């Protein structure tokens, strides 16, 4: 029943502003205190702000005092977070909760950076088609220099899910680099097609890179 | 605006084992300590409120205790559906503070990495870049050491290492080690070696390629 659905996150420059919204569902909104709580990329939880059911009595930690404003709309059953003078340190997944929090919403990601949206360069990694051996060849895909997260990698358009390992992204000074690997039996070796497919939502890029245990 | 320190940071346990997760307050918080469970790709969920009140529907193996500065979250026979992150939060004073959490990992049999080495793709070279990649797949434990050697010499400068989280399906770990190089730097040499030292073995697991087989 209780539902909390957050929205409004996105990439914003250092110093800009943003408005997060939280739509409550399944309770008497009004009788509840509400809080904003964020999870940094290192997965630490930071409480950002709290508002009483009646919306009189607000508290904020010092980090955010005077930059952020918590507000609620008891009619429309909306909790709001106005953020301003945003810093790189406020880059996190922002959650909701109803009062400790007994109910959490899904999170909205907010990334504060100067980096500009850049699509990936996708590179096939075909084994040194000698330096192998068995019915178990591992192919790969390198997904370099893109911003921001995420990217979706598929092996042959989702079909191949057995084998596949997608390694988290590493920020090499304002571009991420990602790799994905797949293990198929030496059938397909050139035996058939193996295609890594990557989509970069933020850049509207869909790319298909055909490996196949090829090359020299 | 008090510190809650959780120990242990990480714990590896077999389903059926008993565990204690500690959370220590830098100042006496009475019984204003709440515990949250968080699983991969899920939001935190309230397990226990006021040191010892399990929230309705929580299964019986979970229980909490403590007062003043020391709290412990005990799980009796750990179930597989219990592996994840655990956090303590204080409501004693403002601002509300949280512990860094404790990660619970499924201890399984020891497994040696399956290592794959790949030379740069031609498309990358044409861009005048060269990434040499090494996948060190499905091993246990998580500790592994990777070393690169170019023409027999060790190379630390330029390596980006990435580790997955415990496989959802088999409890192993995977890691990718990338040796990033200029095009020209790459062509100055012939042999690239990726050597993995893993508990499962006495001697290093090694894969090599030269500018040799096309």
Shape field of chain B: elongated
Which architecture of the largest domain in chain B would the CATH scheme give at its second level? Sandwich
Beta-strand percentage range of chain A: 35-45%
Q: Roughly how much helix do the residues of chain A carry, as a percent range? A: under 10%
Helix content of chain B: under 10%
**CATH fold category name of the largest domain in chain A:** Immunoglobulin-like
Radius of gyration of chain B, whole Å = 23 Å
What is the number of domains of chain A? 2
CATH-defined fold name of the largest domain in chain B: Immunoglobulin-like
Q: CATH superfamily name of the largest domain in chain A?
A: Immunoglobulins
Distance between the termini of chain B: 63 Å
Radius of gyration of chain A: 22 Å
CATH class of the largest domain in chain B: Mainly Beta
CATH architecture of the largest domain in chain A: Sandwich
**Count of helical stretches of chain B:** 2
Largest interface, counted by CB within 8 Å of the partner chain's CB? A-B, 47 and 50 residues
């Amino acid at each position: 029943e209780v539902q909390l659905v957050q929205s409004g996150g996105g990439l914003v420059n250092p110093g800009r502003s943003l408005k997060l919204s939280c739509a409550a569902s399944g309770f008497t909104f009004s009788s509840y205190g509400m809080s904003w709580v964020r999870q940094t990329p290192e997965k630490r939880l930071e409480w950002v702000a709290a508002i009483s059911g009646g919306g009189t009595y607000i508290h904020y930690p010092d980090s955010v005092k005077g930059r952020f404003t918590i507000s609620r709309d008891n009619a429309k059953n909306n909790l709001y977070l106005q953020m301003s003078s945003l810093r790189s340190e406020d880059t996190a997944l922002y959650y909701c909760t109803r009062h400790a929090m007994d109910h959490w919403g899904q999170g909205t990601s907010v990334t504060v950076s100067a980096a500009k949206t850049t699509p990936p360069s996708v590179y096939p990694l075909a084994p040194g088609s000698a330096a192998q051996t068995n019915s178990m060849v591992t192919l790969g895909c390198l997904v370099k220099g893109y911003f921001p997260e995420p990217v979706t990698v598929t092996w042959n358009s989702g079909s191949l899910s057995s084998g596949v390992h997608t390694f988290p992204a590493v920020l090499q000074s304002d571009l991420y680099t990602l790799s994905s690997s797949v293990t198929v039996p030496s059938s397909p070796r050139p035996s058939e097609t193996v295609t890594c497919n990557v989509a970069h939502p933020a850049s509207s890029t869909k790319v298909d890179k055909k490996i196949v245990p090829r090359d020299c | 605006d008090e510190l809650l320190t959780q120990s242990p940071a990480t714990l590896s346990v077999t389903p059926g084992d008993s565990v204690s997760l500690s959370c220590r307050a830098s100042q006496s918080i009475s019984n204003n300590l709440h515990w949250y469970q968080q699983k991969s790709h899920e939001s935190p969920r309230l397990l226990i409120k006021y040191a010892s009140q399990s929230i309705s529907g929580i299964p019986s193996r979970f229980s909490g205790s403590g007062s003043g500065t020391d709290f412990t979250l005990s799980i009796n026979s750990v179930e597989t559906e219990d592996f994840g992150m655990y956090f303590c939060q204080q409501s004693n004073s403002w601002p509300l503070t949280f512990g860094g959490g404790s990660k619970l990992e499924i201890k399984r049999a020891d497994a040696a990495p399956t290592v794959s080495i790949f030379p740069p793709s031609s498309e990358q070279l044409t861009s005048g870049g060269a990434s040499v990649v090494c996948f060190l797949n499905n091993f246990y434990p998580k500790d592994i050491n990777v070393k690169w050697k170019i023409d027999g010499s060790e190379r630390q400068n330029g390596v980006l290492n990435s580790w997955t989280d415990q496989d959802s399906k088999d409890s192993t770990y995977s890691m990718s080690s990338t040796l990033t190089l200029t095009k020209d730097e790459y062509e100055r040499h012939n042999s690239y070696t990726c050597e993995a030292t893993h508990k499962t073995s006495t001697s290093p697991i090694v894969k090599s390629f030269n500018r040799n087989e096309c």
